[PDB]
Nucleic acid binder design. Structure first.
Lengths: 267, 336, 182, 315, 315
DNA sequence: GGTTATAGGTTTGCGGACGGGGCCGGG
DNA sequence: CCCGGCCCCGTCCATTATTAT
RNA sequence: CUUAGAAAGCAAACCUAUAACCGUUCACCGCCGCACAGGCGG
């Protein structure tokens, strides 16, 4: 009961480098396709040649970043696509929310020119991994958070496979995927729960490390442009502050001191 | 002659029966503003500016303190000033109509069908007594045990929760039970019931039989039977009868109020709305109409007469009156 | 000396790309079973995309072995197949060289694991790797053994008038062996 | 007498500010994007609005309902019902009128509800007309929009709905206080305007209680409540009048000041939104024109210059 | 029946920060670029925005929809619905209210959900009004843009779609806590304000549990929850009242402090975007003004001693 | 070239007539 | 002191359902 | 003195989860080697 303690979320700062435009918005007006630029509008109360790249900088969509990041049913649920990235299936209403949150990658370099192309680009970005959404997988249609329609044996088998996959990530650790018929989130005034799977500290850390690893080696190849991630700074956040790393970088903690926070309990 | 009278936010409906054209009763005018009333044809009233309204405004402007119907009848005065000119006056209304639902108060103080006030008494003797269990236990039997209980059967083994809410909810469940066809068993229990309670017959107004009536009358039967075993004086009222429960059925307000601390729930009012089903329109909703716009009232007379009217208004010194109900209406202009 | 054509039948379920990939990999498994270093292929209609026709080259009995073995069994319906026949007398030739870079993420990870490269060396490696690009036609191949989906690239010589005998390694593309082009 | 002089009425213009819709009309039948009508959209109170487009086939008789997204806030502006405004003004006493009875009515007549709000007695002919008249509060800003709403955790009849919501709102309204209706209290059943059923001698004691309340409003002033058996209106050609109670200039001043104070301090917190009266412009009207403030605002007089108008004769 | 003094309401100004759109309005019909109508574009909640160009076909009845690319974020700024903010504040108990019943009402009534957030149970018609009021959270940065999106299959209906997205966002908002609605809990159905239907002895028990919760918030303070059979609102002329529970100054302070605390640490991770509240400024208002902090006042002074206003009295 | 799939499309309540008894007034 | 009218409280009531190119 | 008069549509609710504007979703995972040399396997 009481209060939740431990690491709330794993934040990070990404600094990447590249050349040319990785992600284009499309052709908009004589006309030009363009690239995604934050805050830009072509409408006057306009010519392509008038732009200030300092005011409306080039950026890469979180969608694109995610797409190249993951580059990828029971198999879906056990995939990294299932656990880290989220998903939706139009038939029925089965979904899972991505614990991974990513800001835009914003180019600090102001080199444009008349397609509208780009020279050397330096992207800066921030991000977070939510332990609450990561550690729990809702298999029940009660709250409509249901990942899948399952059988009691399918319940146990699913837990097992995920345990196996997450194990295949980091052999040194010993992850646990625990299925239960009732999982209640901390803080409810009633005891009401959903059938689902909770992941142990080793599993959660393994997944976080896998995600961060993919982020650090992340690279995108576009016809006339490319991006590679240069530096990555990681913060394990036990505080109530969101993007602590963004507002104040003196309070950042690089190595994990505390065990991950447990947001749910079987009942 | 012209009087241009501009108005904003005026109620275009009227919620009362009787007439404002005639002396108000000692008990006042019958109020039908209730949704139950508004469902009935003729109770929903839409009003517009009429000659009566306009003449009432004119008499208001000359400073008449009498009601319109008293002025027309020359009640407390010698002559009615507008008696000649009333046929000579017309008007042109330029309203802007708005359809809004408004919550209107209900003064008749009607007790709510389903509601109660204060705190519930679980300490009431009828629940906590010895006879209580096998008394209220009748209502918890199914239809067959009840039918058998109706004839000579003294056996009720039912052990149930004793609460006013439990009882009233049980009655709620028993009343929503579907009607039953008349058959052998129903014939015998109908004959027995009509033997013990002749004054009422168990049937619908149209061709039906209901379980809740049989249940209630079985409770009455149990009241009559257990009177030999124990004292039922606590279970019945002054001029005895079961509170909130008739022989043909039950009523929630009376039962609750009987077993609750404090008075019955008063209905403070209700929105003004009528939801009707018309063929091809489907569902149609009717709300209160609020009109805002200008009204040109034309009186045809000589310029001298017009000036007389004008100085009469100026001598009256009336200002800022409503129009027809609850409005703000002033006199924008006067043309001779 | 003998060749066979396979024309892709485009579908709502599988567009030309996916069909091309799957039939290519099926052909690969076919050659793996048949164990022949002599069976080749080309892509006649290729014009910046391998195209909708895959042409298999080789011995008539081997092509007969392919038709009979029905390697591409499930996908036969999307495919339209001519009978085996001798190539036309007037024909040019070209090899098929699979173009693969000497740089990869796995190789970089390997160099880090071997302690062979510096922090700045990683950056220069990445810039050289992502700096280069292949305008060449490619196909994304699904796999089993490695359990990966990898992009393979194709490049060809220009209209060599004379044939050069050589091996066709695995997937039928030939490095140093010129297939008939018509 | 021959003429009526002094302040006839106190007109005013109210400027209010707020955020969101304080006063809602309700759920309204509208057509969904699929063509089928969707019966859940909540609409605020809009001036002149109709959900109907007309234009139907004769054999149907139907009305072809509008899309929720189609509204013009310049043509159909957001407003607060005069009913609502008045309700929140007098909201302290809102349920008291239901308990009004002829005997208990003594308490009702001396109060802010009796003198200003007016009242009704259930199952009775006793009444008093409100000297306070108020228009709707009409929004001059007009920032509305279609706003989608939903419920978390399930997809059900309740799960998915919508409202037309509003941002920052600035209301303008007008209103008036009638000295004629305010200064006189009719105790006579003659014109059926009677406030209270009266037995002889009760007039002076009731007058005394009125005197007490009105005095308690502003101790500084010196109010007078005078009962008499016959009260005849001044400028009238009419020779007939009623037994009642008249209030002197000071009392009227107290009541006017009380009203203006309540209006100036008026605030409403309703339906997750709020309204407060920001500014109020007041005119004491001695002229021959009604709601002078509405047409020409240059002729307005803010402080009371003259005495309040006396509309009646002692006998 | 004397006027009420002490702290009337607790107002505040909220400054929040974030990235991307936290709260979306939904898909909206707009015209594609030179391709006429496009049925898929996702739009965030924008205040004052309409998809209509206000140009019509007259008989056809078609209304000209705006271009997707045409928006002015200064005129029609991005905002987060009060509904969403409220949801994420109370987000731990969010699904609990659906399961409510009488004893379940007993559990709900003592909670942050019961006391601060409001609630309704349709079945038994039991309800409580939320003392917490919040304006829109308005983005002052206004960095939006048309952003194109796609699927990797690149063939079918999922295909290509689009959204209007946002960069760095800075929200400003205002809000208030009503002492009147917070301090009193109506247990009686008389005025239809009833929280839960109660028995004779159960009232004090409920009060006790409430006291336990409020105490569990801040051990330093000394809250009291006092039940009574008759509680009368200030200003009624007949002094009529309902059975309920009144909270003392300390309890009110505990709930207010809890609410402000939840508001100050509030953070939302939603729709691939996030928000955190940066700054919060609080004013305890004993004067008659709503949102005094919003109107210009450099001079406000909150004293530790000044007591909360008491709107009800036992009888 | 495609130009959104997927469900959800509101939930609750919103009286009064009729009969008997008691009290008050008139003969 | 007797009769009739009026007023207040207890008792027992309950009818309905449609629409879209 | 008009449609007698007085008359809250009220209380509660995340538009929510997923998706490169682009060359065909996908430049992958390992092996030989000092190699950011050149190649190999699927």
């Amino acid at each position: 009961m009481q209060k939740v303690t431990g690491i709330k979320s794993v934040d990070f700062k990404i600094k990447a480098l590249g050349h040319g435009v990785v992600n284009w918005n499309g052709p908009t007006t004589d006309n030009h396709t363009l690239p995604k630029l934050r805050g830009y509008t072509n409408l006057t109360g306009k010519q392509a040649t008038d732009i200030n790249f300092k005011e409306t900088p080039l950026y890469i969509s979180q969608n694109c970043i995610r797409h190249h990041l993951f580059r990828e049913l029971k198999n879906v649920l056990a995939s990294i696509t299932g656990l880290i990235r989220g998903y939706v299936v139009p038939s029925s209403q089965c979904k899972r929310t991505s614990p991974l949150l990513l800001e835009d990658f914003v180019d600090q370099l102001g080199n444009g020119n008349f397609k509208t192309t780009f020279g050397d680009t330096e992207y800066i970005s921030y991000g977070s991994i939510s332990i609450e959404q990561l550690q729990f997988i809702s298999l029940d249609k009660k709250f409509d958070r249901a990942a899948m329609v399952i059988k009691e044996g399918e319940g146990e088998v699913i837990a097992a496979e995920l345990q196996n996959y997450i194990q295949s990530l980091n052999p040194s650790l010993n992850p646990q995927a625990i299925f239960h018929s009732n999982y209640v989130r901390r803080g409810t005034i009633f005891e009401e729960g959903e059938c689902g799977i909770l992941l142990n500290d080793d599993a959660v850390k393994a997944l976080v490390a896998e995600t961060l690893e993919r982020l650090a080696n992340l690279s995108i190849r576009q016809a006339k442009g490319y991006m590679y991630v240069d530096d990555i700074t990681v913060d394990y956040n036990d505080s109530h502050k969101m993007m602590r790393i963004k507002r104040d970088e003196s309070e950042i903690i690089n190595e994990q001191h505390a065990p991950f926070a447990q947001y749910f309990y079987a009942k | 002659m012209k009087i241009i009278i501009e108005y904003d936010s005026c109620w275009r409906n009227a919620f009362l029966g009787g007439s404002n054209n005639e002396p108000v009763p000692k008990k006042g005018r019958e109020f039908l503003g209730s949704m139950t009333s508004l469902k009935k044809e003729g109770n929903f009233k839409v009003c517009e500016n009429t000659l009566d309204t306009v003449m009432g405004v004119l008499n208001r402007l000359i400073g008449d303190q009498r009601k319109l119907y008293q002025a027309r009848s020359k009640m407390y005065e010698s002559a009615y000033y507008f008696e000649a000119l009333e046929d000579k006056v017309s008007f042109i209304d330029k309203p802007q109509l708005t359809n809004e639902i408004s919550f209107i108060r209900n003064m008749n103080g009607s007790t709510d069908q389903n509601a109660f006030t204060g705190m519930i008494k679980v300490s009431d003797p009828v629940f906590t007594s010895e006879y209580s269990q096998q008394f209220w236990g009748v209502l918890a039997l199914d239809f067959t045990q009840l039918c058998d209980f109706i004839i000579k059967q003294s056996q009720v083994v039912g052990s149930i929760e004793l609460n006013p809410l439990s009882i009233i909810n049980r009655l709620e469940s028993l009343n929503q039970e579907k009607a039953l066809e008349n058959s052998d068993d129903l014939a015998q229990v109908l004959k027995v019931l009509n033997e013990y309670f002749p004054d009422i017959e168990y049937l619908n107004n149209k061709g039906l039989i209901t379980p809740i009536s049989i249940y209630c009358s079985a409770l009455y039967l149990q009241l009559a039977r257990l009177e030999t075993s124990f004292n039922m004086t606590t279970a019945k009222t002054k001029a005895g009868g079961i509170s909130g429960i008739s022989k043909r059925g039950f009523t929630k307000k009376d039962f609750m109020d009987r077993y609750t601390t404090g008075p019955k729930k008063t209905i403070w009012g209700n929105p003004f709305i009528k939801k009707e089903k018309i063929k091809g329109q489907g569902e149609v909703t009717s709300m209160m109409t609020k009109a805002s716009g200008q009204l040109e009232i034309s009186i045809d007379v000589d310029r001298d007469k017009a000036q007389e009217i004008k100085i009469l208004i100026e001598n009256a010194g009336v200002s800022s009156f409503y129009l027809g109900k609850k409005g703000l209406a002033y006199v924008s202009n006067i043309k001779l | 000396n003998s060749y066979i054509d396979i024309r892709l039948k485009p579908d709502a379920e599988m567009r030309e790309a996916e069909l091309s990939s799957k039939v290519f990999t099926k052909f690969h498994k076919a050659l793996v079973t048949l164990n022949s270093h002599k069976i080749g292929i080309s892509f006649p209609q290729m014009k910046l995309s391998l195209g909708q026709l895959f042409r298999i080259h080789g011995d008539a009995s081997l092509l007969h072995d392919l038709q009979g073995l029905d390697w591409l069994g499930p996908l036969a319906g999307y495919c339209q197949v001519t009978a085996v026949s001798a190539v036309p007398d007037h024909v040019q030739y070209r090899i098929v060289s699979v173009k693969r870079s000497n740089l990869s993420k796995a190789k970089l990870k390997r160099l880090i694991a071997r302690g062979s490269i510096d922090k700045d060396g990683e950056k220069r490696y990445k810039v050289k790797m992502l700096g280069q690009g292949f305008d060449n036609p490619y196909l994304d191949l699904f796999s089993s053994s490695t359990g990966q989906v990898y992009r393979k690239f194709f490049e060809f010589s220009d209209i060599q008038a004379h044939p050069l005998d050589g091996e066709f390694d695995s997937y039928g593309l030939s490095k140093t062996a010129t297939v008939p082009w018509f």
